[PDB]
Amino acid sequence: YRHSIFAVTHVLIPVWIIHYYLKYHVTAKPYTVVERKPRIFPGDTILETGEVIPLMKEFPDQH
Amino acid sequence: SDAPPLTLEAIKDRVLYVLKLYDKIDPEKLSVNSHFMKDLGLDSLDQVEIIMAMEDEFGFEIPDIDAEKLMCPQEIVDYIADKKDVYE
Amino acid sequence: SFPKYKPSRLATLPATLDPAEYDISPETRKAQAERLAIRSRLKREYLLQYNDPNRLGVIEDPALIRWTYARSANIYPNFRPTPKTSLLGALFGIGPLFFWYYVFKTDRDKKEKLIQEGKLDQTFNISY
Amino acid sequence: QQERDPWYDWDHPDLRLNWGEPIHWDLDMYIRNRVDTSPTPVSWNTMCKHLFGFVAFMLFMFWVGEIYPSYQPVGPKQYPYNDLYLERGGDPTKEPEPVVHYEI
Amino acid sequence: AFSAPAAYLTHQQKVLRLYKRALRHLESWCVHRDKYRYFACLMRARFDEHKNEKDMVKATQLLRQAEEEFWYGQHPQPYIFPESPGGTSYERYECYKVPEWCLDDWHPSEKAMYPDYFAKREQWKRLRRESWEREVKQLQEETPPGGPRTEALPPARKEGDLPPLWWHIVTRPRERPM
Amino acid sequence: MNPFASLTLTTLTILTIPIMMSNSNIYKTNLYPNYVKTTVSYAFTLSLVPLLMFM
Amino acid sequence: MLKIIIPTTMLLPMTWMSKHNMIWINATVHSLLISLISLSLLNQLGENSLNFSLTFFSDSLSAPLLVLTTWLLPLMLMASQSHLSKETTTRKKLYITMLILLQLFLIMTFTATELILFYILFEATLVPTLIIITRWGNQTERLNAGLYFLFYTLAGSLPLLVALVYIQNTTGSLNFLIIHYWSHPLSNSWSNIFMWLACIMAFMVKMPLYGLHLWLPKAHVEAPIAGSMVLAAVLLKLGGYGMMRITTILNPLTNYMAYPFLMLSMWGMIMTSSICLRQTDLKSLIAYSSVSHMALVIVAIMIQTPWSFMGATALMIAHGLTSSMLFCLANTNYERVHSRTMILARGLQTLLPLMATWWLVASLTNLALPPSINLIGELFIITASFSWSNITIILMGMNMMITALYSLYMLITTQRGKYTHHINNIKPSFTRENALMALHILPLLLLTLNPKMILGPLY
Amino acid sequence: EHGHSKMELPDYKQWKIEGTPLETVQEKLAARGLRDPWGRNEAWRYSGGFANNVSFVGALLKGFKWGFAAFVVAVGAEYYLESQ
Amino acid sequence: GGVHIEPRYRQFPQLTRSQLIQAEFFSATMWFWILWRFWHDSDAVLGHFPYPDPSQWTDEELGILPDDED
Amino acid sequence: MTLCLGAITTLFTALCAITQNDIKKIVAFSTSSQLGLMMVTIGINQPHLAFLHICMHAFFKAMLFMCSGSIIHSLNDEQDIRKMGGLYKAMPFTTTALIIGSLALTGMPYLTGFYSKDLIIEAVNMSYTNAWALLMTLIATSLTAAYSTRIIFFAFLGKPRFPPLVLINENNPLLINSIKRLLIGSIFAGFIISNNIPPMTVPNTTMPLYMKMTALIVT
Amino acid sequence: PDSWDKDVYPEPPRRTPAPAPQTSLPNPVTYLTKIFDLLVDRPVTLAREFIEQQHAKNRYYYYHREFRRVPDITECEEKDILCMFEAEMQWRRDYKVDQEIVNIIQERLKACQQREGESYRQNCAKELEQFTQVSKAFQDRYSDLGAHYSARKCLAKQKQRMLAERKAAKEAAAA
Amino acid sequence: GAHLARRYLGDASKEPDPLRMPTFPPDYGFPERKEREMVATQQEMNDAQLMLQQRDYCAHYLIQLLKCKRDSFPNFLACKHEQHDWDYCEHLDYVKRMKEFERERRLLQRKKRREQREAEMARG
Ligand SMILES: CCCCCCCCCCCCCCCCC[C@@H](O)O[C@H](CO[C@H](O)CCCCCCCCCCCCCCC)COP(=O)(O)OCC[N+](C)(C)C
Ligand SMILES: CCCCCCCCCCCCCCCCC[C@@H](O)O[C@H](CO[C@H](O)CCCCCCCCCCCCCCC)COP(=O)(O)OCC[N+](C)(C)C
Numbered sequence A: 001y002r003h004s005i006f007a008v009t010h011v012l013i014p015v016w017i018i019h020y021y022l023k024y025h026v027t028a029k030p031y032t033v034v035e036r037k038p039r040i041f042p043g044d045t046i047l048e049t050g051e052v053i054p055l056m057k058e059f060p061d062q063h
Numbered sequence B: 001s002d003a004p005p006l007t008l009e010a011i012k013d014r015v016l017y018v019l020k021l022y023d024k025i026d027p028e029k030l031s032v033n034s035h036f037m038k039d040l041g042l043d044s045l046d047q048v049e050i051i052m053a054m055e056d057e058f059g060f061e062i063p064d065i066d067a068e069k070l071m072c073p074q075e076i077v078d079y080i081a082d083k084k085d086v087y088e
Numbered sequence C: 001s002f003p004k005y006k007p008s009r010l011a012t013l014p015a016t017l018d019p020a021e022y023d024i025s026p027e028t029r030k031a032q033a034e035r036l037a038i039r040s041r042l043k044r045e046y047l048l049q050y051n052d053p054n055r056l057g058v059i060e061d062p063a064l065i066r067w068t069y070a071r072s073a074n075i076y077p078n079f080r081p082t083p084k085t086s087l088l089g090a091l092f093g094i095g096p097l098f099f100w101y102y103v104f105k106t107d108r109d110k111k112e113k114l115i116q117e118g119k120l121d122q123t124f125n126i127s128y
Numbered sequence D: 001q002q003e004r005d006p007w008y009d010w011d012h013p014d015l016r017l018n019w020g021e022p023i024h025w026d027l028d029m030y031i032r033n034r035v036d037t038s039p040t041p042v043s044w045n046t047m048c049k050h051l052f053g054f055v056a057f058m059l060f061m062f063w064v065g066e067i068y069p070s071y072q073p074v075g076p077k078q079y080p081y082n083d084l085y086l087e088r089g090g091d092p093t094k095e096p097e098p099v100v101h102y103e104i
Numbered sequence E: 001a002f003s004a005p006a007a008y009l010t011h012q013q014k015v016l017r018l019y020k021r022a023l024r025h026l027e028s029w030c031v032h033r034d035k036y037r038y039f040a041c042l043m044r045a046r047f048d049e050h051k052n053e054k055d056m057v058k059a060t061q062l063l064r065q066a067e068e069e070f071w072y073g074q075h076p077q078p079y080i081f082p083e084s085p086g087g088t089s090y091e092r093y094e095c096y097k098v099p100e101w102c103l104d105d106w107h108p109s110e111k112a113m114y115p116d117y118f119a120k121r122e123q124w125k126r127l128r129r130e131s132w133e134r135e136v137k138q139l140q141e142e143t144p145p146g147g148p149r150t151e152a153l154p155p156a157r158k159e160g161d162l163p164p165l166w167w168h169i170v171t172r173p174r175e176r177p178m
Numbered sequence F: 001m002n003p004f005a006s007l008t009l010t011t012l013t014i015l016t017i018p019i020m021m022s023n024s025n026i027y028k029t030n031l032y033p034n035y036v037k038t039t040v041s042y043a044f045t046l047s048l049v050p051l052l053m054f055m
Numbered sequence G: 001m002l003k004i005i006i007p008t009t010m011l012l013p014m015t016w017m018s019k020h021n022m023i024w025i026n027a028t029v030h031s032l033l034i035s036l037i038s039l040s041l042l043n044q045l046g047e048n049s050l051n052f053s054l055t056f057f058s059d060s061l062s063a064p065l066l067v068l069t070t071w072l073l074p075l076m077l078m079a080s081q082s083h084l085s086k087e088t089t090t091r092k093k094l095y096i097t098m099l100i101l102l103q104l105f106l107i108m109t110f111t112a113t114e115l116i117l118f119y120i121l122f123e124a125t126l127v128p129t130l131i132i133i134t135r136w137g138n139q140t141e142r143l144n145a146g147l148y149f150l151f152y153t154l155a156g157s158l159p160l161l162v163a164l165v166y167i168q169n170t171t172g173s174l175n176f177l178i179i180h181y182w183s184h185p186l187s188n189s190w191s192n193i194f195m196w197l198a199c200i201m202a203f204m205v206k207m208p209l210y211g212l213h214l215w216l217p218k219a220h221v222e223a224p225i226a227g228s229m230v231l232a233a234v235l236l237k238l239g240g241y242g243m244m245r246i247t248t249i250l251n252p253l254t255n256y257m258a259y260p261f262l263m264l265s266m267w268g269m270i271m272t273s274s275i276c277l278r279q280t281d282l283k284s285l286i287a288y289s290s291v292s293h294m295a296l297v298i299v300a301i302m303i304q305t306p307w308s309f310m311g312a313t314a315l316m317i318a319h320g321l322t323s324s325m326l327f328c329l330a331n332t333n334y335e336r337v338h339s340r341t342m343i344l345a346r347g348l349q350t351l352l353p354l355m356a357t358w359w360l361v362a363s364l365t366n367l368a369l370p371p372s373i374n375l376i377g378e379l380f381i382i383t384a385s386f387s388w389s390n391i392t393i394i395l396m397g398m399n400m401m402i403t404a405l406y407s408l409y410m411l412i413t414t415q416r417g418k419y420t421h422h423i424n425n426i427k428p429s430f431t432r433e434n435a436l437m438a439l440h441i442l443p444l445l446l447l448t449l450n451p452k453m454i455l456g457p458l459y
Numbered sequence H: 001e002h003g004h005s006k007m008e009l010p011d012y013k014q015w016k017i018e019g020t021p022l023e024t025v026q027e028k029l030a031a032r033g034l035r036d037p038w039g040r041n042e043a044w045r046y047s048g049g050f051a052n053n054v055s056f057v058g059a060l061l062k063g064f065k066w067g068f069a070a071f072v073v074a075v076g077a078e079y080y081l082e083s084q
Numbered sequence I: 001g002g003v004h005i006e007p008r009y010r011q012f013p014q015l016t017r018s019q020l021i022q023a024e025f026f027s028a029t030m031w032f033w034i035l036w037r038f039w040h041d042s043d044a045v046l047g048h049f050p051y052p053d054p055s056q057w058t059d060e061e062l063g064i065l066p067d068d069e070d
Numbered sequence J: 001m002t003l004c005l006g007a008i009t010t011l012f013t014a015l016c017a018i019t020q021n022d023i024k025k026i027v028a029f030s031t032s033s034q035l036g037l038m039m040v041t042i043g044i045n046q047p048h049l050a051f052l053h054i055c056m057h058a059f060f061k062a063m064l065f066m067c068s069g070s071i072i073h074s075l076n077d078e079q080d081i082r083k084m085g086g087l088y089k090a091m092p093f094t095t096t097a098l099i100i101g102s103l104a105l106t107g108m109p110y111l112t113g114f115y116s117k118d119l120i121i122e123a124v125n126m127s128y129t130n131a132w133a134l135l136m137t138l139i140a141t142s143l144t145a146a147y148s149t150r151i152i153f154f155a156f157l158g159k160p161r162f163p164p165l166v167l168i169n170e171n172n173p174l175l176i177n178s179i180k181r182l183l184i185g186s187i188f189a190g191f192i193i194s195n196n197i198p199p200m201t202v203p204n205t206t207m208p209l210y211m212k213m214t215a216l217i218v219t
Numbered sequence K: 001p002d003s004w005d006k007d008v009y010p011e012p013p014r015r016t017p018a019p020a021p022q023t024s025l026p027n028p029v030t031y032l033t034k035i036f037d038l039l040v041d042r043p044v045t046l047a048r049e050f051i052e053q054q055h056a057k058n059r060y061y062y063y064h065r066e067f068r069r070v071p072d073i074t075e076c077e078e079k080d081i082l083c084m085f086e087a088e089m090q091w092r093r094d095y096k097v098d099q100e101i102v103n104i105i106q107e108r109l110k111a112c113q114q115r116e117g118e119s120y121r122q123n124c125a126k127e128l129e130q131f132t133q134v135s136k137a138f139q140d141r142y143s144d145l146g147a148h149y150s151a152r153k154c155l156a157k158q159k160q161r162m163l164a165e166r167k168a169a170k171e172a173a174a175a
Numbered sequence L: 001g002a003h004l005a006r007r008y009l010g011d012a013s014k015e016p017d018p019l020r021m022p023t024f025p026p027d028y029g030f031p032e033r034k035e036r037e038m039v040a041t042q043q044e045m046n047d048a049q050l051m052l053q054q055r056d057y058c059a060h061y062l063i064q065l066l067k068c069k070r071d072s073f074p075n076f077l078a079c080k081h082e083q084h085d086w087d088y089c090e091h092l093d094y095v096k097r098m099k100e101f102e103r104e105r106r107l108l109q110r111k112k113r114r115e116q117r118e119a120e121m122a123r124g
């Protein structure tokens, strides 16, 4: 019971304000949150476009 | 810390215990009031060795000016009790 | 025979290695006696004034007052213009100023010459 | 004041001074929180010589190591696209002088 | 600490002090107990070779070469007891030592707590108030003219007397007040 | 959206609540050290999540 | 601007027609209200100024100084309450009158659309301060101190007057706006060199410049607490404000006339800081720290770059607040011990813990701990100096190091260690002293939230 | 609740120099004609559970036996499961 | 938090079997982990790829002609 | 400059640690030497490896200090190793934890300190560096092993040397749990973090037999 | 989000990979994200809807201020103080706008460097060039004016630059 | 290492300089001179944005390794084959570099023996 109330008033309430602050105010302004672009490898498919990145040049496999 | 509250009985018993382990002093002749130079026939170097043994057994070292004038086991017990603030 | 210990200013000679204490003489003993006598008189006065239940303030110490007065306010009336004081004052109060003046003037002249020649690469240097 | 008697019953135990005694002119320079002139196990000159020697020898040997570096029996590493020209600095409109790597 | 220092150290005191210092530094050098005991007995043997020596000049010639040898072999990092003037906990609890007079500045709401203690404290204050008036005259009469020659204080000689200048010795804060 | 930012700021933010509470009643009691230790443990278990997202 | 000038004047009849036991309450309350009103001045524009009338105008360099001047009076009243208790009602009212007159003169000085009116009020501030030092001073040297604080100042400012009137004979106006808009370069001539020196040394003496700083330790040590607060907080900043105002006409001579002074400052901030390491008096230590900080401000003003000016403004405000708080702490110790010696009363943290916390915060701000506005000013000045020349950093760096040392020295000598045994009259700190320290320190840590309000017109 | 139950000291006749290095110390002293008056005081450092010492390699190899047993059991299980 | 353990005055202190089994278990798991990693992944210590001998290569592959052509 | 500074730092601090009597001073000089090793790693252009070493050193050095503090509290505020004697059996959990910490600190294979320090040594052997810096890095590794030996020997192996009133006690849940969490860390975290992070440098795939093992021989 | 102009702050299309689980082992990241959404984003979203409808109940506007053009310092008489005042105010406003333009370009550069990951030295060359151009322009316009800067000093600096350019071009033409 | 001992104690010009490799024409050995082939193109090898020093001829195996480490994330021990292949490719690159080192070494040997032989013939 102590750890239940602790996680509510010490973890749950702060993360609500932080998430509210970030997703409606900080991200209202441009360039405030900049994410490094995710890595693209051959064979990956992109959700927005749907196209498929081609595979490689079939290197000679040995050992 | 968690160190027990040592008392005057403990100090006296420990001092006599250390003195009995001193083979230069026979255990049946020594008493709490037994003088060192006269009643026990000890030199001054034996007195300073006794003081050093007290220091090593109790964990604190007595200043030499106070050490050189400790001549009875009762006096050593009283000095240690005064230093460590012992009630009873 | 052992290697000897050499005292210096910041590492003084130990008491046990002082040959002076081994030249024991009657006047030396009398001097030590009167030294401890004055020490004991001062200690007696301090303890008399310290243990008093009626005294509810600070014990005014003449020695501390003398130290502060001599350090602060007794300097100038005892100051006498001598070659030692004059040279030390001139050096320590003029030399650093002219040294730093020369250093900064040389640096800024070099920088200005580089700017006039145009070979400095002050690109992106917006804030100054 | 660090080398004064620590077992004496001073009036100011932390300062190790007595009420009424004359105070050293430079007291606030020797206050046990600052320069102390206590005797040392080794002479001052010996420590100076040893410390100076230790530092000078280390600097000299570091210079020597700079003069005579250590490495492995290898040639320089090889990078595919003209020593990786396009993505190190850029400048794509110059067509740099090509270099091709020797397969051995 | 407790004993007032004398005008000087006699040859006996210097020799005893050097013996204790040498034993301590030898213990520092010889960590193990058996080795320390062997070398301590050997040091004692080397120490009393000149015990029965008679003239002062050559004895003072000794204890000097001995001091030089000690300073040569003094183990530049000796063992120090934790509460000693060089120990790792020498003045650890000096920040917890509060003077007794501070208690006089407590608010009455604070003194409402702990009332028996303050009754005993008032008894102690009254006892000091009377004993001081007795002690001042005792010290005035017992003191040699021209000022004390040593900082040693006389005991109490009457029935109701208390030792002169006793208040600030018996009322030490504590060794480990907190 | 994108819990990474929210959690990686929430851990630092909740690390400071006991400092805010240092003037409360819990500071005058013996439950303060346990409170601080529990807060640090919770912050650690919350910080483990953006580490998983990065991995 | 009369909405601030008139109430400060009305503080006088209100004080003189008050009860024998209600003067302090009334003065404090109405001074705080005047400060709240003057809070209105902080709003500024990115353009020229807030020109109220032909006589008074406000700027974002004048606004923080005016706000600090208005805020400082209630604190001075609170600290002066204690040591004037045994004074007759007439003399207490006279003390309050001197403080009110000084505030009024400073308020009119910082607006001062015209340079001669600025000079007149700038030198009018000399009389109430002199009377405060030489009348309600504890020591015998106060009289001597007063003479110093007088003549130095006048020695610097009598040539200035001449220069000022001379300028009006050549340009026709001393109005600051026309002086700004109709500025022309100064030729490299002996006449122009001397006019530059006459315009500069008047404000150089009051910063004070190293070598002209001798009056300051005397005046700060021998003055009462309110005198020390007003001297360290505001009266030192008059020179900096005057230099910011008057250097708009001294170009391009300042490009090389600044060399004799920059050195005297750049080396000076070292020497005075070193002096703080060996000092047996708290008040002298705080005075010399003020000298070092104002030497850095002098450097910033002489460099004459936007970052220099922003840093100088921020440092002036921060130093005023910090030095006032340090003087208040030293006075709380002095009122208990009556000694004014650092080494005498020791181990005060164990006896007075909250005052020890106040000491720690004051020393931390004095030490320039980020992100306090002290370090904002220091950092801006250091960046500007580095752009001026890359070697200045060495000197700057050393000063930073030395500062930390003596600051913590002052904290360790008085608060840490073992208490002096024979001192038994150290009563617990009153609500008055704690509130005084709180009201000094909270504005600093609030201003660190909104730096642009103290960064000046070049922000 | 603290450690207050009136602990007793051992009897001082328990401490005998017999079975220690202190015989070696006494013999090497007597070969020159000397005795250690405090030799018996320290016998408690060699008397009880302090009578047995552990070597450096033995200290490093504190749990080698159970660990090796578990390791070989795991290897046997892995071998019997992979070759199926 | 724990149990009451009394001083001993010159004899071995009282030891709970709990701490003994715990210390033994952790030492045993340390040694088991070391052995398991050495068995399963021994290439981290002894290496996996051989180091060629430079003198064992022939001049045919090294671009060497018999000191007379070029 | 970074390489030279790190090398001289690690050598000089290990040489100072080799003969200290205070346990806390020994461990402090140990962490100073490890910081010098981190700076050497920076100097040979290997930043992520230095970060990884930081992460491992955190675990095992924190646990080493906690064990030292446990002993200090156990023997009534004592720090000088001349007065700690036989503690291998007197307090077993501290003994085993500090043994594991000293093994990890010296890069015993397949512990937390292996996955960082072994790679540090391999990288410093095959890089175009100062000969002197490499030499002093090797000597620093040897001296690290030597002062770990000094701690173990002088504090756990001989006969007891503490005052007669034995107050040794370990049975507190707080101390045991705090030590065991970093025990599990300093055992498994090296492997876990090394295998979870993406590759951030080219590997040193091929090595001379003597050069690959040189760290083990030195230790 | 329409809160800012996409042309002033360009952002690439943000192509992202699709999950290709190669093992049947369920990951903790997806479950953690699901529970995070359910426990955090939904209450925040409902609170935002409540606040947004409260705001929509009371809708009011604010406007951007427009400034007309005035004669600049080049077309002001030598001692005519009114035109000098107007030109000075205009020049100060233009200086502020130029500062904000440099700020915008710097924000673009920083966002590019963070976004591009490890290929920033190549994929931010356009932003680096654009910042170089803007920095050169701003430095020519405003640098070395001093703390007591004004429109007259900027004009004098420009005039000296133009004299230097004209002299150099004339010398090159007749060589 | 021995090459350090040889170069720093023997003839400096006898052994090659790592800063100046190579000092001989690539075709000086044999005229075929087959070229190295790079597998991953610029676009994908940028989209994976490895590192500027990881952008060598072994990049394709590193791409495969990253593909698996992203794909089989929770089981961080799923793919060792790709790690082994990348290590093998790096080992091959290192042995090619060692071959280049020894090639220039023995080429300098032969060159030196040459000009000393013509010196001997000229003196004769
Ligand atoms: C010890 C127990 C503590 C318990 C309490 C814990 C609570 C945690 C909070 C503690 C500090 C955390 C700081 C978090 C920031 C919140 C406040 C901040 O956001 O407000 C600042 C604003 O505060 C003010 O700017 C600073 C106060 C100014 C102080 C002036 C003093 C006035 C009288 C003092 C006398 C003057 C003497 C000095 C002369 C100059 C900055 O706001 P800003 O994002 O920018 O824009 C304001 C809103 N807008 C968007 C509409 C424009
Ligand atoms: C003591 C505590 C400090 C207080 C304040 C100290 C700061 C005051 C310093 C005054 C500033 C410097 C004075 C003049 C600076 C101008 C530069 C000039 O003097 O130097 C050369 C000039 O050479 C010499 O300086 C000539 C004058 C020499 C006489 C000056 C006295 C030197 C020592 C006196 C010190 C007294 C100062 C303290 C008084 C109490 C320049 O070469 P030149 O091209 O030719 O002259 C250009 C100017 N023109 C065009 C008008 C001709």
Ligand SMILES: CCCCCCCC/C=C\CCCCCCCC(=O)O[C@H](COC(=O)CCCCCCC/C=C/CCCCCCCC)COP(=O)(O)OCCN
Pocket (backbone or CB within 6 Å): G152, G155, G156, G159, G162, G163, G166, G190, G191, G192, G194, G195, G196, G197, G198, G201, G205, G212
């Ligand atoms: C606490 C000590 C501080 C004292 C500071 C005092 C020094 C101030 C500097 C000199 C003061 C007087 C300067 C003149 C006032 C301005 C007048 C002006 O600008 O006009 C000049 C006035 O020029 C002068 O009158 C200069 C004469 C100076 C005589 C007094 C000299 C005093 C000593 C100066 C040397 C010291 C300099 C540094 C002092 C630092 C302070 C210690 C030009 O003359 P015009 O007649 O207009 O010519 C136009 C047609 N060609």
Ligand SMILES: CCCCCCCCCCCC(=O)SCCNC(=O)CCNC(=O)[C@H](O)C(C)(C)COP(=O)(O)O
Pocket (backbone or CB within 6 Å): B043, B044, B045, B046, E011, E012, E015, E022, E025, E026, E029, E046, E047, E048, E050, E051, E052, E053, E059, E060, E062, E063, E066, E067, E069, E070, E073, E074
């Ligand atoms: C590790 C450090 C190195 C060790 C260095 C040590 C060097 C020591 C060598 C010199 C040995 C000496 O004593 S130096 C010889 C000094 N002279 C004398 O010993 C003559 C008279 N002795 C006394 O009077 C004393 O009191 C006494 C009778 C001893 C006791 O008496 P009690 O007890 O009845 O009081």
